[PDB]
């Protein structure tokens, strides 16, 4: 019954509402500049980078940054594994299968959220409270310059879809259950649980955006540049490992870079 | 109005057999030897319990490898208590933040309450009730472990002789959820006016349900002073837990 689906979208979304605290409509509105929200202070420079630490509340310059983007990571990766848990059959799976979901699809929904925060000009950082431009960051140190450039690449071809949150939400967990993910004990019962999620999307994205024609297709496609853009920062990150053998990796970040 | 009242009572009742897969009425079947069609793999020492791995597939030190398997179940409950907790009227229609609050703090006291259907003087039934571990096998693990559920049991014999049945627990189940008590939350008059709905319904379902039974509405809201207990004990021996014992479980099993 098509009923039945929307009752699953309303729970995921809810589940998402409750993980995520920037949402993409908390986003959108520090980005245009609404009054339902402030706004960021932005910085393009070594100045306002230094002006930022005094302004933005948040714990060289190019390693400094990084270190900032990985602790943000960490409590990305937390909130995406909150979010799991909430969806159906997820907690009931295989223990070593659950584990082996989050540890693939977390990085391909970092990138995805990370899309919420994202402009063709910068992203907002430390909870909207900034505002880093694309240019600040192709102009840092060697390895870490064009670090986040496919992202900002990726972001403007997937923001084109004009997903809201409730879309997302989906989406998302879709990404989790997937089940061609290696390793997989048992790809069955992902498979169907991931069925549903499709079909709670598909009704999602028709009813949600009744004239887009195929955004379901052109969505399920965008998981191609996910796909691709995780394994260029798997290898980005292996430089900077070698390159910095001072630079230290939180260690559940690590454990989910088995190579 | 009673016939209100009883609405609600049928309302939860259902959404208690579509929340939660092992009913009392179902666990007490396995536990009493009546229904003798399924009887569950009994685990009574070491030799049984490697054996019991074979037979159920656990989906996770033997005492280690126990903890976590209660840990595993343990996040499956809250999934069950947070899809019951939506289909208490009004729930949804609570400020989002007071929702994840009363989830947050109240599925602990559910969760032992309902591990209190599971259980009798001698153990209880684990996996889909296809296990049962024996209440001396717990007694006997290396410590703190061995000691870890004992207080737990005596909760439930004491918690067992109320006689509730699934209809009964019910309506109790969405009185602990509404408890406008908890740390932090921000606008607790529909909470109260939701609970204050549950303990009439709750009221009248024991009366009608047990009208041998005096007072059992008090004695039941007595209990929630063990359960209060028993979770502020359980919180304290997994921090020494915390203490004697990677990193991607550690946040699914996060406190
Ligand atoms: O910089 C990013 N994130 C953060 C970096 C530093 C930080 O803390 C910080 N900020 C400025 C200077 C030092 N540290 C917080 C964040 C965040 O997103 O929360 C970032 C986000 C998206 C992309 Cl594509 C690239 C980056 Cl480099
Ligand atoms: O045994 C219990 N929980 C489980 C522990 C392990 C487990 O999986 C398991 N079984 C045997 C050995 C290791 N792991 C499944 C359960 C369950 O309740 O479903 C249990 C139930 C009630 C109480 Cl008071 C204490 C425990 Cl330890
Ligand atoms: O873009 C990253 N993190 C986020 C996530 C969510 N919001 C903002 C920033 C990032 C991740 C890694 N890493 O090693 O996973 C390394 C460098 C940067
Ligand atoms: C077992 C182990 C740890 C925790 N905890 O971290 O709070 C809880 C439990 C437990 O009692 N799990 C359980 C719930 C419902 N039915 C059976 C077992």
Do not use: W
């Not at 630490?53 to 990305?76: L, M, N, P, T």
């Not at 082996?100 to 950082?125: P, Q, W």
């Amino acid at each position: 019954e098509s009923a039945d689906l929307r009752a699953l979208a309303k729970h995921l979304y809810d589940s998402y509402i409750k993980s995520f605290p920037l949402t993409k409509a908390k986003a959108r509105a520090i980005l245009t500049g609404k009054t339902t929200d402030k706004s960021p202070f932005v910085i393009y420079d070594m100045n306002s980078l230094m002006m930022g630490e005094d302004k933005i509340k948040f714990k060289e310059v190019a390693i400094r940054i990084f270190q900032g983007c990985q602790f943000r990571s960490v409590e990305a990766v937390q909130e995406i594994t909150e979010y799991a848990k909430s969806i159906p059959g997820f907690v009931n799976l295989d223990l070593n299968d659950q584990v082996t979901l989050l540890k693939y699809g977390v990085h391909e929904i970092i990138y995805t959220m990370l899309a919420s925060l994202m402009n063709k000009d910068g992203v907002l950082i430390s909870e909207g409270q900034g505002f880093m431009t694309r240019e600040f960051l192709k102009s840092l140190r060697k390895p870490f310059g064009d670090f986040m450039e496919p992202k900002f690449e990726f972001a403007v071809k997937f923001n084109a879809l004009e997903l809201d949150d409730s879309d997302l939400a989906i989406f998302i967990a879709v990404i989790i259950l997937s089940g061609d993910r290696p390793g997989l004990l048992n790809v069955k019962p992902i498979e169907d649980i991931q069925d549903n999620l499709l079909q709670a999307l598909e009704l999602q994205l028709k009813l949600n955006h009744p004239e887009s024609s195929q955004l379901f297709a052109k969505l399920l496609q965008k998981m191609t540049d996910l796909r691709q853009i995780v394994t260029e920062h798997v290898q980005l990150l292996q430089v900077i490992k070698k390159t910095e053998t001072d630079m230290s990796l939180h260690p559940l970040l690590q454990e989910i870079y088995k190579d």
